[PDB]
Ligand binder design. Structure first.
Ligand code: NAP
Ligand code: DDF
Length: 159
């Protein structure tokens, strides 16, 4: 199945590396935890922002242009991206906006981190009908010495 994983600020603003202020090792640990040894599908801008393949994961990059890095697998359509994952239990789509929009209809799971921040941003996580999703897990954390904002992990499952 297909899952999306995202960090959402207020108004469900999303962004790239440099745009995202917070320092949530807790959130990056959550990401690592939930994506490890699963294929990750991302759009070209997200790829360029991360700057290096995620280790121990198959990295699949969407782009309309031929690939420019032999360290990752390049694909030119959603269906090709899915095919390039082979037969795994769970495919992780790690953004960005354009990619989340295309994969949401296909997804069965959302892993969201709701961050208590207003950030500069126009790019938002896709709107999804709440009627089609059930929250099955959530866990709130206050900011601390090594995490800058409060945040809440959430997992939703498609009914
Ligand atoms: N300055 C501003 O006001 C502003 C506002 C909004 C966003 N932004 C910028 O937007 C970028 C992030 O956008 P995003 O989150 O939407 O990026 P993203 O999803 O991570 O990457 C989008 C790219 O993925 C590829 N892609 C996606 N779907 C595809 C498909 N079906 N077939 C082939 N290729 C596909 C395309 O690459 P190719 O281009 O290679 O085809 C597309 O440009 C950042 O660089 C951010 O700075 C800036
Ligand atoms: N939960 C969550 N938080 C986020 O900040 C993001 C998402 N999801 N989803 C999409 C995008 C992911 C951007 C993104 C992903 C991974 C790394 C990265 O390098 N992760 C390492 C751990 C970082 C470290 O070593 O400190 C990893 O191996 O997973 C950086 C940026 C932003």
């Amino acid at each position: 199945m297909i899952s999306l994983i995202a960090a959402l600020a207020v108004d469900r603003v999303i962004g790239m590396e440099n745009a995202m202020p917070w320092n949530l090792p807790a959130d990056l640990a959550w990401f690592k935890r939930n994506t490890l040894n699963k294929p990750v599908i991302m759009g070209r801008h997200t790829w360029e922002s991360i700057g290096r393949p995620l280790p121990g994961r198959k990295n699949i990059i969407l782009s309309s242009q031929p690939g420019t890095d032999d360290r990752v697998t390049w694909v030119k359509s959603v269906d090709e991206a899915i095919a390039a994952c082979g037969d795994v239990p769970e495919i992780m789509v790690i953004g960005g906006g354009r990619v989340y929009e295309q994969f949401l209809p296909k997804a069965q799971k959302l892993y969201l981190t709701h961050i208590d921040a207003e950030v500069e941003g126009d790019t938002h996580f896709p709107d999804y009908e709440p009627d089609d999703w059930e929250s099955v897990f959530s866990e709130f954390h206050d900011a601390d010495a090594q995490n800058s904002h409060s945040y809440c992990f959430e997992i939703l499952e498609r009914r």
